[PDB]
Amino acid sequence: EEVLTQSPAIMSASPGEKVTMTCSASSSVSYIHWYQQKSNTSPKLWIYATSKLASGVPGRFSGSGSGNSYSLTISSMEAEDVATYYCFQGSGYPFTFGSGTKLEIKRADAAPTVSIFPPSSEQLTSGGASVVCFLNNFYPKDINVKWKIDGSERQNGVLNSWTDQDSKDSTYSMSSTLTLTKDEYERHNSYTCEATHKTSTSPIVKSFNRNE
Amino acid sequence: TEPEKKLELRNVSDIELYSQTNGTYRQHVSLDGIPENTDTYFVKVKSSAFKDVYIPVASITEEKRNGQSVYKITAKAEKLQQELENKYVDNFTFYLDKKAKEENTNFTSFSNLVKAINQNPSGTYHLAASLNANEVELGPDERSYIKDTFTGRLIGEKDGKNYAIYNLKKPLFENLSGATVEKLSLKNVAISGKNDIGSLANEATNGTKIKQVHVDGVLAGERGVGGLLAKADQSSIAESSFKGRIVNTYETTDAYNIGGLVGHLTGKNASIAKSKATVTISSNTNRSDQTVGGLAGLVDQDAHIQNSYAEGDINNVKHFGKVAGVAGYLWDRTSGEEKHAGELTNVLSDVNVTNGNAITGYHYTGMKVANTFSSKANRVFNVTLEKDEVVSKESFEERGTMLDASQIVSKKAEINPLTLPTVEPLSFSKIAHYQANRALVYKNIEKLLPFYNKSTIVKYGNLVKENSLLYQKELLSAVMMKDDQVITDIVSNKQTANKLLLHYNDHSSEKFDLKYQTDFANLAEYNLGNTGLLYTPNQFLYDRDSIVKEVLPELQKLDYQSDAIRKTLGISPEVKLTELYLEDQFSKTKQNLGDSLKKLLSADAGLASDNSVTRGYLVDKIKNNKEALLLGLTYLERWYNFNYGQVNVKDLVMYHPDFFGKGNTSPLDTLIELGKSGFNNLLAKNNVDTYGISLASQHGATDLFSTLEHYRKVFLPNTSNNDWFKSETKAYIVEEKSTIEEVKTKQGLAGTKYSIGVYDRITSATWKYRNMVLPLLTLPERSVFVISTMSSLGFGAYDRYRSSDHKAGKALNDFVEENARETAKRQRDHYDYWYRILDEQSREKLYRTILLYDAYKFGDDTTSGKATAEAKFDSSNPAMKNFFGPVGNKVVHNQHGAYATGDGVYYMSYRMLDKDGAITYTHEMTHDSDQDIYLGGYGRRNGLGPEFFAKGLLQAPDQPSDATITINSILKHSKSDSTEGSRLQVLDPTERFQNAADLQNYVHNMFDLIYMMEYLEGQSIVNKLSVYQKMAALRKIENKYVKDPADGNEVYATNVVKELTEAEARNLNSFESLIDHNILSAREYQSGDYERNGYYTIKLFAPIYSALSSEKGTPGDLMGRRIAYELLAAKGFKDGMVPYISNQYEEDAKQQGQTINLYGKERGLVTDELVLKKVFDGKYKTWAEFKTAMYQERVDQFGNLKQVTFKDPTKPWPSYGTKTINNVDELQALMDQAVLKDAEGPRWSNYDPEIDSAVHKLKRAIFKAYLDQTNDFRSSI
Amino acid sequence: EVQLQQSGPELEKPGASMKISCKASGYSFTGYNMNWVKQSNGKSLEWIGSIDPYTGGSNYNQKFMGKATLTVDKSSSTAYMQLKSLTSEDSAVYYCATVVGRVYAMDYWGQGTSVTVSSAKTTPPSVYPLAPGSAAQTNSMVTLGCLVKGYFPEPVTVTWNSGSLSSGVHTFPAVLQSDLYTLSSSVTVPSSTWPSETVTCNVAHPASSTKVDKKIVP
C-alpha cells in the first residue's frame, strides 16, 4: 500500500496570501495527480503528473515533488480557491488518495447573536422537551457553548452541529440543542445556554422563562 | 645453438596508447601532438589470440617516414625482444600516424558516422561496409545516438549490395521529418528505455520514406514500444521487416500502445503496405486504452494497410486490455468516421495470441477490413469468471494449409547483408629448426606459454612425441588445484596445482601433475610431469595488493535498494526490483567481495608495468561500473554455482573465458557490460536470451545447453548429460517408464520425442519453460517435488502440501516423495492405457509434453488444511523465491478450480499429487489432447463442446462410490480394500484392457447388462403403472436449434428436458411406444434445459428410451453423449465413436451438399442421419431401427442364457445373504414389487431419491452381483 | 461530451447486497477504462476498483477484495458495481470514473449515487420553533428557525412564512442521532417585523412525505 499524507488538514489564509500543502507517500512514484473538491460536490482534477496542470485552472495553482516528498504550491489565495484537495496517486496499484487538506479564508473574528427557544406546545403533547440555541455569523469557528436547567449548568441531552465556513461572508453559524422530557422542562422554569469567544471574552448568555 | 627466452608478442593485432596527463586515462588515437615532455602514456596492445598487453612507454619520437610525419613510439619492458622486420630487438616500439579524413565521409566508422550526422542534420549519407555499433560509448543516460529530430535526409546502403550495423542499445535518429532512409538494417539490437521507445526513431512527423529496411534482434523498453517508429505521424512506411523479441513486463500504468511497425497509426496520407515481421511479442495489457495491434495497431486518422503479412506470436498476460493480430484499436479518439478508423487489406498472421483478439481489438459494426485472413494458431483468451475458463472469441476470418500460398501474396523475402568487420586471426615457421608435423603442436604449445621467443616456443615443440595427444587438436587447457578451478595465480602461484586439464577438440581432457620447478617474478613457470615441457599461466605477476587496498572500500559501500544502483540499473523508480531475486546473492557477493575481486583481476589484463600509475587505470576501470560489477558478479554467482562432479562452473564462466577458445576477449569487461546490459536483459527469465546477448560470441559459443553439453564431454564424460543433470539438482525428479518394451526402449532414447529425460525435455526446443533449467539447478534444498511421465512433465511445491499432519521437516518430505511415486504410477498407467487404445499411428503425437504447475498456495505447517494463500510474489517461501518466481509463470490462479492453457495444466481446487486430483488430471488431458490425439486426426464435432468430451464422454469416475458408465483407467485399487463394496468401477485397468478390441468386448457385455435391466424396467412400467404413477415416472426430451453468439447459424440442436403431457402418457401402450414417444425416466433428471457444452453425464442405470437424433448437424449434450456410449458399445471407439465426434465426414457432407459457414469461411456441416448411414448404411436406415435391433438382439441374448449365480443384499442394514435369481422372469417378478413399492408413497423430494430409491438399489443389486460374479464384464449369456 | 449518470441514491439494510450502475455517452464507453470509488463523509475519498469495459476487466482494492465485484453492459453502454455483505461502513455516495492518459478524473465522474445502508424505517422529522433569549430580539434583524430532527432517510426541502419567505434563511448541516437523521435552518428577518408579523415553515421531505409547519412564539 502507498499512503499519501496531506498537511495542514485545514489552512486559514487572507486573499492574496501564499498557501502550500505537503503530502507524503509510503513509496516513490513518478507522477502525482491533484484533485480539488468543493464541499458536498463531485471532485475534479486540478494538477496531474506532479506538475502538469489540469484544464480550467488559474495560473496561481502550482505543484512539485520527488521521492516520497510531494506538495501543491498556490501563489495567491482566492474565494474560488476555498476547496478540499487530494494529491491522489494511481502510478502504483492499488491507486490511492491523499490524506485530505481543505483551504479556508483568514477573516476577522465576528462575535455571535446567541439563541434559546422553549419546547413547543406540539413538543409537549409528544411529552418530550427540546430547547435549542444558535451563535450568529461568528468567526473563527472556535466557539464553546454551555447549557443550563433553571440556571444550573447542564451538558446532557445536548447536541451541537457546526455550520461550515459560509460562502458570501465565509463566517460560521451554529446551533446546539438541549433535549430533555416535558417533566424536566416543567421542572425548570429558566433555560440558559452561553457562548464563549476570543472575540468577546465575556460568554454571550441567552435565556427565556417557561412562564414567558 | 641455444637461443634465449625473452618476452615476444607474436599475434600483434594492433597497438594503442592512453595518457593520465589530465588525471584520467584518455586515448590519443591521432593528433597525439609532438612528443610530450612527460611520458605519462601507457601502451595497451590488442592481440586477436591473447588478452591486451600493457607497459608504460619509455621513449616517443616524431620523424618523417617518406617526408611523412609519423609519431614514433617506444616502450621499456623487462625482456620484450621484438623480431621486427626479421631482426630481433630488445623492447617493443611502433609508429602511430598523424590523422585520418574518413569522417567527412561517414562510410568507414560508426563513431565517425555519429559525429558526421551531428555536424549537419540534413545531408546524404552512405556506408562502405557492414560495421559494429559498439564503437559508440552509449552515454550514461543519452536518449538516442542522434539528438537531432530532423536528420537522415538520404542515408543509403545501395552503394554496396547491402550493409547493416550490429550491437545497438539506443534508437537511431530519435525523430525524423521529411527524411528518406531505406536499405538500412540492424542485427544485435538491444534497445531499452524508460521513454516511448521506437527501434528506428521515436517518430516520423512529416512524410518520411521507410522501405526495404530489415531490423532484427532485441527491443523492449519500460514505457512505449513501436516496431520501427514509436508512432506513425503522416509518414509513408512499407516493405519493412522487424523480427525480434519484444516484451513490456513492467506494469506501467500509462496506456502505452505497442506495434509491429508503429505503436500508434495516426497518418491520413500515411499507410503500411506489403510489410513483414515476426516476434515473441507479449505484454500485460491491463488497460483497454493500451492497444497492441501485432501489425502496428491503433489504426487511427485514416491509416490504410496495403497487403502486409507478419508471422509473429503474442502471449498477452491480461485479458481485459485490447490487443489483436492485425489491428489493436480500429476505433478513434476523434469521431467514429468509418474513414478515420483506417483500412486493412490482404492481411494474415499466424499469431498464437493469448488473452487477445484474432484480427481487430475493437470490433465495430462498420469494421473497415473487407480482406480478412487468419492462420491455424491459438486465440483462446481466459474469461476469468467465478470458475476460471478460457475460450476463443471466434470473430476472425480463418484459412487452411494454403497459408504458404497466402505468404506468396507477399512480394519480397529479404536481403543478405554483407558480414561485419573481420580483422582476421592470421595465426610459427621461418625458424632455425622447424618440424612440419609439429606445426599444429607448435600452435597447441603457443597456447601453453605466451611471451616466449618463437625459437623457444618451437624448442618446446621438439620435445613432443608422436603418441602425444598434442598431435590431436588441443583446445585451450586450464589449471586447477584438487579440482578447485584455481584462477588466483597471485595466491596459489607458490602452491602446486594437482593437475593441468589439456582440453582437446575431441572435447576431452588429459591430466599432467604440475610443480613450481622454476620461479620468475616476470612470469611463474611449472613442470610438465615426466615429459619435461615447461608451463606458465599467462600473467606478469604485477603488484595487485595496491589495487586491492583501494578498490574494495568504494565498491564495498553499495545497497541492493540504492537509488544510484537503480539509476545505473535499467529500471524505473516505480517498478519493484523483485524480479532480480538477487538481494540474497547481493548480500553474499558483498560478504565474499574481497575474494571475488581477487579472482577477478587475477587474469583481467597483461601488465608488465612496475609503474603504479598504470595500475590506477584498472582501479578507474572498476569503480566506474562498481554498481554494475556488484550486480553482474552477483547475477553470475546466482546463476553459476553448480559443480560438474567436484568442479564448480562459476570459475569456468566467471573466469577462464579462453578455455572454450576466444581467450583474447576481456573477461573483466564481459562482467561490466553484463551489469549495464539492463534489467530487461538481467530479468530472471531473460537468462536464456541473455545467453545469446552476452554468453554467446564472448565464449564463441552458440547455445547455453550446447555449452553445458560441451561441458559433460569435458567433465564426467561416460556419465549421461541428463545423468549429470539428474544427479546434480537438489529437487527430487522421477521418470517412471511404461511397461510396453517398445515405448520403454523409446524412453531409453536420448533422441527428442522419445526420451522421458527431464534434462532433455526441458532443454528441448518448443518448451516455453526451457529457461526453468537455471533456477531448478541452483535450488537450495528439496523444496521442488518433480515427476516425468509419457508426454508430460510433473512440477509441484512441498510447501503447497505443507499443513498440520504434514510436519515441514522429514515427515512432509516423506509423504510428498512417496505420494509423487504413487501419482507417477497413476499418471503413466493412464497413458500406457491410452497407448493400447491408440493403434491408428496417432502415436506419432504420443509423447507431446505439457507442464503440471501447482496452486502456489504454499501453506504453513500450522495451517490445519490446504492453504488458500495467493503467495503472488516476494514471499519467504523457498519454493517461490528459488523456483516458479524466477521462471515467472503469471496465472489467473482461482480461489477454486484447475484450468489448462492447452500447452499446460494448473491445480487450485485439487493438488497434482492428490489421488482425487488424478481424475482432474485426465479431465484436463481430455480438454487438451483430443483435437487430433484421442480423435484420429479430425477436429471435434463442429458443435460438440470442449468440456462436453469429459463430464460423461471421456473422464475417470470422480469416485469408485460414484455411479456413472465410465472407464476407471486412472485409478487402480486393491480388491481386499473395503472400497470393494459399491466399487461400481474397474478395479484394475490395463490388465483386462490389452487392446481397443478388448475394450469393445468389455463394453458390449457391460451395456448388455445395462440393456438387460432397462427392458426389465420398462416392461414392468408399461405393463403395471397407475395413470398418475406414469406421470411422475417419465420425462420428455426436445431439441432447440437456437441462435448462438459465436455462429450466425442457429443449426446447433440443444437437448432440453420437460415433463410429458397426460394425453401423451395415455397414448403409450407398448415398450416400443417408449421408443416412439422418446420419453425417459425423470428419476435422475430435472426439466431445467441442458446448456450446450454444459456439465451433463450418463447416470449408471437411468433408463433412456429416447433416440432424439437431430437432422441438424449437432444434436445436443446428453443425447450426443448417450448415443456415443451405445456407439462404443456397438462399434470400436476408432470405428464408430470417432466418426460421430470428430466431424471427419465434413468432406463427404460437402459431397452430400450439407454446409455451414464458420469464421466467415464457407465450410461443410455433418448430420446425425449422414453419420447414421456412413456407420450403418443398410443395417438400419433410422436411429430408432438401430436401437430397436439392439433391443431384440438383446432380448434373445438375455432370454437364451443368464447365470443363476446372482445373489445380493438389496435389504436393510441387517445383511441379506443369497437372492440366487435363477431366471429373468424371477428377476422381473421381484422387479415388479420393488418398482411398485418405489412408486407407492414416493418422497421424490429432499435429496438422494435414487441411491435411497428401491429401483436403483435393485438396479445396482444385480449389477454389483454380476460385477462380483464375473472376473470382468467378459460374457453374460 | 461524455456524460456519466450513476444510479439514483439507494438505501439497503446491512448484511445485504445491492448493484449500482453508471450510464455513458459522447465517448467510447468500452474504449476508455472505467473506475469506481467510495465517498465517506468521515474519511477522505477512497478508490474501490478500476474496471475495463470492453473485456469486462476488474481490478480490486485489497480492502474491497470479494466485498464487491464489477460488471458492465457494453450494449447499454452502462457499467455495474456489484456490492455484497453490505455494512453500515459501506454506506456512501459512490462515483464512476473514466481513465484518460492514465488519469481517472476530472473526466469523467458521475453525478453520484448516495448509497446508504440501514435497519431503520422511514420517519418524519420533529419541527419546533427556534429564536432568541435575553437581548438578540432588540437587533435590527432577529433570526427564527424550524427543527428537522429524528427523521429517516434524507432528502429534505423547506419554505418559510407559509412559503412567503425563501431568502435570509440559512440551512445548517445535518447530523444523525440514535440512527434517525437530524438537521436545522434559520430565517434572518427584521426584529422590527416579528412577533409583530408571524411565519410558519412549509417543510417538504419526499421519502416520508412530511408537510409540518411550526409557528414561532416570542
Author numbering:
A (entry chain L): 1 to 212
B (entry chain A): 674 to 1100, 1109 to 1958
C (entry chain H): 1 to 218
Pull verbatim passages from the article behind this deposition.
All classes of bacterial IgA1Ps cleave host IgA1 within the heavy-chain (HC) hinge region, the linker connecting the IgA1 constant fragment (Fc) to its antigen binding region (Fab), leaving the light chain (LC) intact while separating the Fc and Fab. The overall structure reveals that S. pneumoniae IgA1P is a multi-domain enzyme, broadly comprised of N-terminal (NTD; residues 665–1070), middle (MD; 1071–1611), and C-terminal domains (CTD; 1612–1963). The active site is formed between the MD and CTD domains that bifurcate the Zn-coordinating residues of the HEMTH motif (residues 1604–1608 in the MD) and a downstream E (E1628 in the CTD). We have determined the structure of a member of the M26 metalloprotease IgA1P subfamily of bacterial IgA1Ps both in isolation as well as in complex with its human IgA1 substrate and solved its structure with a neutralizing mAb that provides insight into blocking S. pneumoniae IgA1P activity.
A comparison of the neutralizing activity of a previously developed mAb used to detect secreted IgA1P21, referred to as mAb #1, and a currently produced mAb, referred to as mAb #2, reveals that the latter potently blocks IgA1P cleavage of IgA1 and this occurs at stoichiometric concentrations. Moreover, this neutralizing mAb also blocks IgA1 substrate binding. A 3D reconstruction of IgA1P in the presence of the neutralizing mAb Fab fragment (mAb #2) resulted in a 4.8 Å resolution map (Resolution shells are shown in Fig. 4c and structural parameters and refinement statistics in Supplementary Fig. 2 and Supplementary Table 1), which facilitated an initial rigid body fit of the mAb #2 Fab with likely delineation of the individual VL-CL (variable light-constant light) and VH-CH1 (variable heavy-constant heavy 1) chains. The final refined model reveals that the neutralizing mAb simultaneously engages both the IgA1P NTD and MD domains, which confines IgA1P to its closed conformation through intimate contacts with both domains and thereby occludes substrate binding. Specifically, this conformational change can be described as “closed” for the free enzyme and “open” to allow for IgA1 substrate binding, whereby the mAb occludes substrate binding by binding the IgA1P in the “closed” conformation. While our cryo-EM models demonstrate the specific site of the current neutralizing mAb is not completely conserved across such strains, there are several highly conserved epitopes that could serve for the creation of broad-spectrum vaccines or multiple exposed epitopes can now be developed to block multiple strains.
